[PDB]
């Protein structure tokens, strides 16, 4: 009951290590940070997050 859902989006541009352009499905495009433990190189243009 205390688990707020996320919003699915797609990576687009692969900015600097800590910056990713992500387009939210049926929504706008943001520049977002990545969770530390999530680890990187698994988020390439088109990847679902």
């Amino acid at each position: 009951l205390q688990s707020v859902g996320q919003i699915v989006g797609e990576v687009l541009k692969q900015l600097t290590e800590e910056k990713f352009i992500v387009k939210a499905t049926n929504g706008p495009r943001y520049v977002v940070g990545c969770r530390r433990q999530l680890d990187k190189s698994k988020l390439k243009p088109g990847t679902r997050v």
């Binding site: 009951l1 688990s3 859902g5 996320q6 919003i7 699915v8 499905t25 049926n26």
Partner: protein, 54 residues
Amino acid sequence: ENSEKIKVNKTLPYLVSNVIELLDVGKCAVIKTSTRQTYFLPVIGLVDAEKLKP
């Protein structure tokens, strides 16, 4: 007491939505809210996980 609290927290005005995609990691969801929106749920919630077919 626990069931009463769950009943109070399941206040009626739900948002009718789909279960477009179902994943595992426990189970998850990629529900499609009828507000033309898509929401990933890491925890399905109160539902019984009755196979919740896509």
